[PDB]
């Protein structure tokens, strides 16, 4: 059946904005996962998980009689899809159970792991999500095998369809670099937002870069991809050596024995895949990666044997029984147990990427320190495992249950507790009057609150106006934020704040974070007034102001908007057309297509464009809240053509006279071109739509101002 | 960006069940189109339309100073996508304005027609939908040019994204038959559910079959395609000759001058397409089809000049200026006016498909009668134009406004008015108890109500339990409906109904249509009781019973379920896998994926399967409403394999012992295979889900019972 995608493969896809509708969700519209989890008997779940560890099923027998290693890998792959560039991937939505991740080569036989968990899932039902369960199982595997974890939070609600994520353009699984859709260019530069070296891998190739078994060059890939997953050298060493303290890899015969991945398997396979024709196809005969490595002398117990082995032997390149490059210890005795036959032992072995931890000079120093100070290794791995598994959960206010660590960690972008009375409605009215009397314009107030709030992204729940980080490095310096204008606004707001706070008794005080948002609201109110309309913009206080020391500057860089169509801003020239970037941004903001439409048309007329560009400002009453953008965009009296100087800027001329009326970008004009966007624009550009426009604009404005407000949610 | 569709192109697509979410809809949740339309000043809209007809715009100048022909073609194409096989297409959702239809070759330059209507759309806003306005505009065109229409109903609510429709498997626009994705097989047999001869055409090729200019062979294609749009020979002749009384075709130069269709055009084209490099690119120079024919001496006035010309001349094969086959009148004078140059006239011309109306012997008889009796032609055309434009609107209860024709037409599947008091809640309780006391079983009651209600399809809003047509030909004899069992159930219900109605005073009576549904409700309540759960199933009375004489048996054929996975039924063997047919059925029933899942699992355990097949009946307490289907399907203790006899039937055996536990079809096992459906099955197969399962099953049951209840809308 030929589809619109087939006929017009490069047309914009809006369906990403209408994912996760109430239609596809089996739960009632009022289901609240947090409330269900809070009633879960977490202790009981953990007891059942402990029991499961050594309850081997014949259809996928447990290595060494303990599923712990398999489950640690499962949990680490759940979390390991995360990219700091967009916040997408990670463990937080349980996406390992849907396409494409359920069938990525690097997730081979994790289908078995998840199936082993169905009886527990079934038993506890909606009170524990798959997403939480995959991580909790990892934790319990560690604890069962003697490693004390740093903690655990619940609260990852399940999702019910695949996430729309760009994982790369290759059309061949595991394609090596330099192909027609290469994710690499130049001196091994990985394209943003990707954080893996090949299509269908979690981070790097365990044989080495493009299969070349060089630990030194593999280290480079490890460092780059782990950095793109928010991990530094210490965390990376701790995680790799920590993980590979447990379990084994599987490569007992040739890979050609392994059949279809789960999404390709027959219906009789009932959601499992990679059925293997090699011997028994499982257990002692398992084939997963094609490597056959067991790292330690006690693969089911926490030990310090990983670094003892790494440093205590010299290593020789060899091949697994499937033909994959791996390393064996020169001159070693057979000291490593077999997973199934107590009569068999094996020499120590390592992956190319394990050797990276010794042969990369920077890793070597950390690895040696961990070898010499095993308590440092244990603590670092515990902290890194918690970060790995929680990095996409967002503010600590979302963390649920009795095992949440009290310690506040920098990567959580912490916000101080509020310890004082909040401003009330009378106060908010007084502050808005003061803001409007200061001389700050509608454009300034709306621009600043937009800049503050629109850093949020729902993918990892980072960003937003809480914290007033717009006043700190690096947000205060971002070009999209108009640093000089922003400075002048914040100076004026801080003076208002100081005078208000100085007049209070009790401990009542307003945060700058709140005032920035309230001042935005006043701008929108004033804009509606300018247009002859009474309007009320909702405002909820309770934001607090974070410090610079609570704000990791390098982590914050990934939130910089290098494209924000809502301010008609593009920092540079990208391969991806700007209207595609607009929809991407709308998706991060959690906006539907109607919300995106209404919001952008209003921001244009309120003066939110970077640099006060006239592009898309289709009104003769700037700073008045009207539906002018839509009415003028859709006027057939105007003809549009790209400029000679710049094909991405368009001029709108009177069709009869040739007179220039407007200019616009791709982001502006897509609303008059895309057949679904234009249908939305028509609703807002109709003669009966002014009040609808205002009300819908206020609603979406408020939505954006509240995106990070999990203290209320 | 590589997508799941790329990796696994043959996997089932559920996204067709989650269209039309509240996310994509710009109107509020409470918007009611009928409420808006009923307050429209329809007379004012018509006056504006009338003025438009002769108000030429320079960007698309009106032929003969009158846009009437253009708008008639627009409205005919809006309606002309309709297929009776599945009810998809038609004018009822205004899909002409979205992909792919907005960019089909046969819809070339209707983008201009719709753009001409934006000022009126804009003026009246939400009170008239695009869907309604396209049809109204065609009516006003006809009226303005002296043709009396049969009437008009409003009430087609706008939609906001493209409909999922299979329009064929060709990968090239207009591909001639016999290609690798040919829609023809055998002796020119067009594949169901298609109703056009080439990809991107409305019905047939105006040059002749695959371009061969033979009117006799063209007539075969006309008859076949029009029949597949629910039009018989008289209607077809009336419509083609009626339409081609007006306006002209456009083929003033070569088609290579014409550029990208709208979905492929540049952003600056602002939603229009087919920009032409030929001379002025419009008006006298227009190119649309490539044909250049003007049918009558007064293209802007109703006349009987089409048949005067068709029969008064002999015709010679010639070529348009674009090189298309068309026909000119031998020996004729220049009597046809030019569209722009009042000093030029032209000889009469015809399409190959126009000549079909004279050279096909059956058409010729009707054409001659219309020629000799043009009042008969006008009436037939009026009636057919109404049918064409309303055929997908559903029951007459949906028809809005002051111009609805009072005459009830057989094709409307009419339901008699109710002229008596309805049964109340107590009455319904009495009747449910009487039904259960009769000895009718849960299986009989559920199966019967399912059979009655589940003929509905939301594509054209035909079918459903209203009418009690299950008791009439042909429904009573459909194999899916188990004719002998059905007869015994209906006999028993009719005796209940007789006794109840005989005992009433005051005119109160219950219809059989209502009692069939109420009886099914009693079955579902009893099944819940059998499971240890007391529930009340909602029931709304007010259905009426239609007669055989009010039922077109030939038209009702297309509603026969030849695949109904909800009864594990497949009438024959199809190319399309049965699970794809299940999702198609769910889409026609308007079900989400969760709704489909719940409904199927409950039906299985209630005994709804045709023939009492055990396939999918994964319970040892049949006729109790439990979640056994899901618990048992998802039990990893059971292993599934296709049978030797039939690859589409699977045995489920104990994994340890080999003992046979169950059998199932593809429809059953897809819920344990597809990763999204399995995630749904898990929710309902969880230990906490009994109450949820019952409640959601009752809800979706009631939804299905009420699908055709537009009297309650
Ligand atoms: C450079 C980074 C990494 C690479 C290249 C890598 C590679 C692999 C490979 C190829 C396997 C074998 C899969 C199989 O055949 O069954 C594996 C196993 C495993 N990995 Fe890693 N890994 C990495 C990082 C990590 C991290 C960060 C963790 C956890 C903190 C982890 C924990 C494990 C565990 C526990 C197993 C054993 C699975 C079992 O016993 O079934 N790995 N890894
Ligand atoms: C066998 C069925 C039919 C064939 C093959 C056919 C073919 C065509 C073609 C090729 C055009 C020219 C498009 C262009 O170049 O502008 C056209 C125009 C038109 N058709 Fe038909 N048609 C059919 C049936 C009908 C029906 C059922 C109606 C309405 C009842 C209709 C009304 C019109 C009108 C009014 C025009 C003139 C458009 C104008 O003035 O711009 N057609 N037809
Ligand atoms: Na994420
Ligand atoms: Na339809």
Coordinates of C-alpha atoms in Angstrom, one line a residue, chain B residues 213-438:
Chain B
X213 CA -9.2 5.5 -27.3
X214 CA -11.9 3.0 -27.8
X215 CA -15.3 4.2 -26.4
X216 CA -16.7 0.7 -26.2
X217 CA -13.9 -0.6 -24.0
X218 CA -13.9 2.7 -22.0
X219 CA -17.6 2.0 -21.2
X220 CA -16.6 -1.2 -19.5
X221 CA -14.2 0.6 -17.1
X222 CA -16.9 3.3 -16.5
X223 CA -19.5 0.8 -15.6
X224 CA -17.2 -1.1 -13.3
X225 CA -15.8 1.9 -11.5
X226 CA -19.1 3.7 -11.1
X227 CA -20.7 0.4 -9.8
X228 CA -17.8 0.3 -7.2
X229 CA -18.9 3.8 -6.2
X230 CA -22.6 2.6 -5.8
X231 CA -23.9 4.1 -9.1
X232 CA -25.9 2.1 -11.6
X233 CA -26.2 2.7 -15.4
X234 CA -28.9 5.3 -15.2
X235 CA -27.2 7.3 -12.5
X236 CA -23.8 7.1 -14.3
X237 CA -25.2 8.4 -17.6
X238 CA -27.0 11.1 -15.8
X239 CA -24.0 12.2 -13.9
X240 CA -21.4 12.1 -16.7
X241 CA -23.7 13.9 -19.2
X242 CA -24.9 16.3 -16.4
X243 CA -21.4 17.3 -15.4
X244 CA -20.2 17.7 -19.0
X245 CA -23.1 20.0 -19.7
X246 CA -20.9 22.6 -18.0
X247 CA -17.4 24.2 -18.5
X248 CA -14.4 22.7 -20.3
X249 CA -11.2 20.7 -20.0
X250 CA -7.7 22.3 -20.1
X251 CA -4.9 21.2 -22.3
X252 CA -3.6 24.3 -24.1
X253 CA 0.0 23.1 -24.4
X254 CA 2.3 20.3 -23.5
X255 CA 2.1 18.8 -20.1
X256 CA 5.9 19.0 -19.6
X257 CA 5.2 22.6 -18.9
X258 CA 3.4 21.7 -15.6
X259 CA 5.5 21.5 -12.4
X260 CA 5.2 19.9 -9.0
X261 CA 1.9 18.9 -7.5
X262 CA 1.1 20.7 -4.2
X263 CA 2.7 18.3 -1.7
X264 CA 6.0 18.5 -3.8
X265 CA 6.0 22.2 -4.5
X266 CA 8.2 24.8 -2.9
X267 CA 7.2 26.5 0.3
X268 CA 6.7 29.7 -1.6
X269 CA 3.8 28.2 -3.6
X270 CA 1.8 28.4 -0.3
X271 CA -0.1 25.2 -0.8
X272 CA -0.8 25.5 -4.5
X273 CA 0.8 23.4 -7.2
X274 CA 1.0 22.5 -10.9
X275 CA 2.6 25.8 -11.7
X276 CA 2.8 26.0 -15.5
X277 CA 5.5 27.5 -17.7
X278 CA 3.2 27.5 -20.7
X279 CA 2.5 31.1 -21.8
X280 CA 0.6 32.8 -19.0
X281 CA 0.2 29.5 -17.1
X282 CA -3.5 30.0 -16.6
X283 CA -6.8 31.1 -18.2
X284 CA -6.6 30.8 -21.9
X285 CA -3.3 29.0 -21.4
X286 CA -4.4 26.5 -18.7
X287 CA -3.2 23.0 -18.6
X288 CA -5.0 20.6 -16.2
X289 CA -5.7 17.2 -17.8
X290 CA -4.0 17.8 -21.1
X291 CA -7.3 17.5 -22.9
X292 CA -8.9 20.4 -24.6
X293 CA -12.6 19.9 -25.0
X294 CA -15.6 22.1 -24.5
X295 CA -18.9 20.2 -24.6
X296 CA -21.7 22.7 -25.2
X297 CA -22.6 25.9 -26.9
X298 CA -23.5 27.5 -23.5
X299 CA -20.9 26.1 -21.0
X300 CA -22.3 28.4 -18.3
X301 CA -26.0 27.4 -18.6
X302 CA -27.9 24.2 -18.0
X303 CA -29.0 22.9 -21.4
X304 CA -29.7 19.6 -23.2
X305 CA -26.9 20.4 -25.7
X306 CA -24.5 17.6 -24.5
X307 CA -26.8 14.9 -25.9
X308 CA -27.8 17.1 -28.9
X309 CA -24.1 17.2 -29.8
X310 CA -23.3 13.6 -28.9
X311 CA -26.1 12.3 -31.2
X312 CA -26.1 15.1 -33.8
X313 CA -22.6 14.6 -35.1
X314 CA -20.1 11.9 -36.0
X315 CA -16.8 12.0 -34.2
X316 CA -13.2 11.9 -35.4
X317 CA -10.2 10.9 -33.4
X318 CA -7.8 13.8 -32.9
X319 CA -5.2 15.1 -30.4
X320 CA -5.2 18.0 -28.0
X321 CA -2.3 20.5 -28.0
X322 CA -0.8 18.4 -25.3
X323 CA -1.0 15.3 -27.4
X324 CA -3.9 13.6 -25.6
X325 CA -6.5 11.5 -27.6
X326 CA -9.9 13.3 -27.9
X327 CA -12.7 13.7 -30.5
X328 CA -14.0 16.4 -32.7
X329 CA -17.2 16.7 -34.6
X330 CA -16.9 15.8 -38.3
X331 CA -18.1 18.6 -40.7
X332 CA -19.2 20.9 -37.9
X333 CA -19.4 24.6 -37.8
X334 CA -17.6 26.6 -35.1
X335 CA -20.5 26.9 -32.7
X336 CA -18.8 26.5 -29.3
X337 CA -17.6 29.6 -27.6
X338 CA -14.0 30.3 -26.6
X339 CA -13.4 30.7 -22.8
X340 CA -11.6 34.1 -23.2
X341 CA -11.8 35.5 -26.8
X342 CA -15.3 36.6 -27.7
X343 CA -14.5 36.6 -31.4
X344 CA -13.3 32.9 -31.6
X345 CA -15.6 29.8 -31.7
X346 CA -14.7 26.1 -31.9
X347 CA -16.1 22.9 -33.2
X348 CA -17.8 20.5 -30.8
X349 CA -15.5 18.1 -29.1
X350 CA -15.9 15.0 -26.8
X351 CA -13.8 12.7 -24.6
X352 CA -13.6 9.0 -25.5
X353 CA -15.5 8.4 -22.2
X354 CA -18.3 10.8 -23.4
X355 CA -18.7 8.7 -26.5
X356 CA -19.0 5.7 -24.3
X357 CA -22.5 7.0 -23.5
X358 CA -23.5 6.6 -27.2
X359 CA -21.5 3.5 -28.3
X360 CA -22.1 1.2 -25.3
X361 CA -25.4 -0.4 -26.1
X362 CA -26.9 -0.2 -22.7
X363 CA -25.8 3.4 -22.2
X364 CA -27.1 4.3 -25.6
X365 CA -30.7 3.4 -24.6
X366 CA -30.5 5.6 -21.5
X367 CA -28.7 8.4 -23.3
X368 CA -31.4 8.4 -26.1
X369 CA -34.2 8.5 -23.6
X370 CA -32.5 11.5 -21.8
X371 CA -31.9 13.2 -25.2
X372 CA -35.6 12.8 -26.2
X373 CA -36.8 13.6 -22.6
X374 CA -34.5 16.2 -21.1
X375 CA -36.8 16.6 -18.1
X376 CA -36.1 13.0 -17.3
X377 CA -32.4 13.7 -17.6
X378 CA -32.6 16.7 -15.3
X379 CA -34.5 14.8 -12.6
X380 CA -32.1 11.8 -12.8
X381 CA -29.1 14.0 -12.7
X382 CA -30.5 16.0 -9.7
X383 CA -31.1 12.8 -7.8
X384 CA -27.8 11.3 -8.7
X385 CA -25.9 14.4 -7.8
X386 CA -27.6 14.4 -4.4
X387 CA -26.7 10.7 -3.9
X388 CA -23.1 11.3 -5.2
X389 CA -22.6 14.1 -2.7
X390 CA -24.4 12.5 0.3
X391 CA -23.6 8.8 -0.1
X392 CA -21.1 8.7 2.8
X393 CA -23.0 10.9 5.2
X394 CA -24.8 8.2 7.0
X395 CA -28.3 8.0 8.4
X396 CA -30.7 10.9 7.6
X397 CA -30.5 11.9 11.2
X398 CA -27.1 13.4 10.6
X399 CA -28.5 15.7 7.8
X400 CA -28.6 19.3 8.8
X401 CA -30.1 22.6 7.6
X402 CA -33.1 23.9 5.7
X403 CA -32.6 22.2 2.4
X404 CA -32.7 18.6 3.3
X405 CA -34.8 16.7 0.9
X406 CA -38.0 15.2 2.5
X407 CA -38.1 12.3 0.2
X408 CA -36.6 9.2 1.7
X409 CA -34.4 7.2 -0.6
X410 CA -33.7 3.6 -0.6
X411 CA -30.0 4.0 -0.7
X412 CA -30.1 5.8 2.7
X413 CA -30.9 2.5 4.4
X414 CA -33.8 4.3 5.9
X415 CA -35.0 3.8 9.5
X416 CA -38.7 4.4 10.2
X417 CA -39.6 7.2 12.6
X418 CA -40.5 6.2 16.2
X419 CA -44.0 7.3 17.0
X420 CA -44.5 5.8 20.5
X421 CA -43.2 6.0 24.1
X422 CA -39.9 4.2 24.7
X423 CA -39.2 1.6 27.4
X424 CA -37.7 3.0 30.6
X425 CA -35.1 1.6 32.9
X426 CA -37.5 -0.7 34.8
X427 CA -38.8 -2.0 31.5
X428 CA -35.3 -2.7 30.4
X429 CA -34.6 -4.6 33.6
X430 CA -37.8 -6.6 33.1
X431 CA -36.9 -7.5 29.5
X432 CA -33.3 -8.5 30.5
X433 CA -34.7 -10.9 33.1
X434 CA -37.2 -12.3 30.6
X435 CA -34.4 -12.8 28.0
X436 CA -32.3 -14.7 30.5
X437 CA -35.3 -16.8 31.7
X438 CA -36.0 -17.9 28.2

